[PDB]
């Protein structure tokens with residue numbers, strides 16, 4: 607039955623560079639990151655409130671495993687390790703708040719949503735900056 611589960615391919619990416627900028631990434635690396643972001647591919651397996659998510663680009667791949675309501679460890683977009691906790695906001699929207707394991711830095715979070723016309727929308731936030739990325743099913 608249709609939920610977040612599936613193979614998703616990015617179709618749009620808005621404010622990605624500004625987000626990296628807030629996270630301290632210098633301009634040459636941001637431009638390379640933006641170019642890599644146009645091959646983002648996401649594989650999701652969902653069962654009840656347990657998720658497996660694999661995000662990959664051309665040269666890199668990451669997997670996360672979590673259950674809504676339970677703390678897990680992952681990393682911020684710029685690769686600093688964090689403690690994360692996901693909660694539902696509605697039937698097909700979830701929101702994750704992150705806290706840095708070490709150090710200080712911008713407040714980051716992310717949301718994912720299945721829309722009514724079949725898209726997966728990711729938002730990623732750092733302080734005041736919101737990146738939106740839109741995916742469709744492969």
Ligand SMILES: *C/C(=C/c1ccc([N+](=O)[O-])cc1)C(=O)OC
Pocket residue numbers: 643646648659661683716718728730739
């Ligand atoms: C689901 C998900 C997707 C994602 C897209 C892009 C990046 N990124 O490093 O640019 C990370 C993840 C996610 O949970 O990431 C927050």
